[PDB]
């Protein structure tokens, strides 16, 4: 349990740390190298000092709920300023200049024939 | 549907009409040649200009005009040929040397025959009689085969059609055969009439 | 609309076992031209079956193909039954073997193929079930022959 979130017990530490929101593979490797810990050692077979060092490194990366709040604040700011990206966020359409005549399902939801 | 026979045979048994090489100014040379050819065509309409070859070397342009009426192009005193030389030099900064090649039998030249029949059609002759006489004289002058075609609003009819006449052998699928092809256009009061002529004067 | 029968291809024997059948099984297993992958898979499967049976790999393989090779089939026309050609027998045996092996639940294709050939040698495999169904429907439609 790191950053208030449980991580798979039987998964290697490097992979299991990716389950933390805001932690991917690159940041997981970087954290693991900063807080010296075997790459292949599973979290279940881990030492309390290693866990404490990992927590110490993680706490300052600005992950999880803080990251979510920052992203939501950015999205809300661009919605509020009445930007083009904000209008597209409100309408649930692609924001990064895709074509909506086809292949916009991940933004427009399921097909409504 | 039919490959242009000249296009099919260029580089196999027919040499290019543009004989030169370039690596950098290919486009400028090509379009200079194109404007030279366009000016020669516009200026020597009356002359039976069968075709024109262009070569360039040592900053010179050698023009070879194969025509059927060399007297008209040269002039009695060389005045016409000198004037043409001067106008080509005006068009192109380079120095142009012009030669004229006589065609003994103008009735065996595809381009000349096409232009003659197109002129007759403009004069409003019979699109059948013109082709018949063309083919007759070409065949009597020893041609192994000839084909003529005229398409468009033949007798002014609203519905355009084509009609063709043939005699002898014209093996358009033989790559050996040196088949002379030409297309011309008559600008009749009803519009464009396209005449095509294929001539096969035999193995050479 | 066909002038007649065309010549048939002839494959070389397996370099190690010297078996046309083995070569054609490797070709069947091969996907996208990965002949090396097919070779390693087949060889690992042969080693696994040899270990698990204490019996010659080629022997058990030949017994499995003999078990899963049919003799009658049915072609739509109602389905009319007809005998199967000797080369069609081998083709169908290998094709069914590979298909049901790929359909097995083992983790790796080598394990799937080994288990499937073992089951076919015991006469209790998916390919055996396929052959049995084919023979049953051929017998059911025997009249239309």
């Amino acid at each position: 349990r790191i950053a208030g979130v449980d991580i798979p017990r039987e998964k290697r530490v490097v992979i299991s740390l990716t389950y933390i929101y805001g932690i991917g593979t690159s940041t997981a490797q970087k954290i693991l190298e900063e807080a010296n810990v075997s790459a292949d050692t599973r979290v279940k077979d881990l030492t309390d000092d290693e866990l404490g060092r990992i927590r110490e490194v993680v706490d300052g990366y600005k992950v999880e709920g803080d990251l979510r709040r920052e992203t939501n604040l950015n999205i809300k700011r661009l919605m509020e300023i009445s930007s083009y990206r904000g209008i597209r966020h409100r309408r649930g359409l692609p924001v990064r200049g895709q074509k909506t005549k086809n292949n916009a399902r991940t933004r427009k939801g399921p097909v409504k024939t | 549907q039919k490959i242009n026979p000249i296009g099919l045979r260029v580089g196999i048994i027919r040499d290019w009409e543009a004989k030169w090489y370039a690596e950098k100014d290919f486009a400028s040379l090509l379009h200079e040649d194109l404007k030279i050819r366009k000016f020669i065509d516009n200026e020597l309409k009356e002359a039976s200009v069968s075709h024109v070859e262009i070569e360039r070397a040592a900053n010179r342009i050698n023009i070879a005009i194969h025509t059927g009426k060399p007297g008209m192009v040269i002039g009695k005193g060389g005045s016409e040929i000198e004037k043409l030389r001067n106008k080509l030099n005006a068009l192109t900064d380079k120095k142009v040397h012009i030669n004229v090649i006589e065609i003994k039998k103008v009735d065996l030249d595809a381009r000349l025959v096409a232009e003659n029949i197109a002129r007759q059609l403009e004069n409003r002759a019979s699109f059948r009689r013109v082709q018949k006489q063309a083919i007759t004289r070409a065949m009597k002058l020893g041609a192994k085969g000839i084909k003529t075609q005229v398409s468009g609003r033949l007798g002014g009819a609203d519905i355009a059609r084509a009609e063709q006449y043939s005699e002898g052998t014209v093996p358009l699928h033989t790559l050996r055969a040196d088949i002379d092809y030409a297309h011309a256009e008559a600008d009749t009061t009803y519009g464009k009439l396209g005449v095509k002529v294929w001539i096969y004067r035999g193995e050479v | 609309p066909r002038k007649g029968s065309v010549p048939k291809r002839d494959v070389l024997p397996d370099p190690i076992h010297n078996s046309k059948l083995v070569t054609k099984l490797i070709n069947k297993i091969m996907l996208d031209g990965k002949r090396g992958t097919a070779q390693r898979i087949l060889y690992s499967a042969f080693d696994l079956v040899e270990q698990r049976s204490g019996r010659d790999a080629l022997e058990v393989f030949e017994e499995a193909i003999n078990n899963i090779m049919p003799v009658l089939e049915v072609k739509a026309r109602y389905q009319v039954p007809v005998e199967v050609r000797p080369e069609r027998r081998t083709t169908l045996g290998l094709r069914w073997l590979v298909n049901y092996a790929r359909l097995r639940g083992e983790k790796t294709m080598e394990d799937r193929l080994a288990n499937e050939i073992l089951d076919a040698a015991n006469n209790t495999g998916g390919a055996v079930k396929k052959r049995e169904d084919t023979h049953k429907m051929a017998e059911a439609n025997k009249a239309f022959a």
Partner: protein, 80 residues
């Protein structure tokens, strides 16, 4: 342009028109066709009539609009 090594783009005419009458507090509306001009802090509190294709949409500049283009606040297409 976008690259940091080049400064944020803005039309010189637009920038000088904004700078003009900066001291006076009776700031007026600035007609502009420059949808591509970036919004600098100098633009805060200004009104730009930005051409969107057929008409000049008025746009009021605030602090949160700094760093964006003037075109991002004058939509061009109409739907429903």
């Amino acid at each position: 342009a976008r690259s940091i090594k080049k400064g944020p783009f803005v039309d010189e005419h637009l920038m000088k028109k904004v700078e003009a009458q900066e001291g006076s507090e009776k700031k007026q509306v600035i007609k502009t066709w420059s949808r591509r001009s970036t919004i600098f802090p100098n633009f805060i509190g200004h009104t730009f009539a930005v051409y969107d294709g057929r008409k000049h949409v008025p746009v009021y500049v605030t602090e949160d609009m700094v760093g964006h283009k003037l075109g991002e606040f004058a939509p061009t297409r109409t739907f429903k």
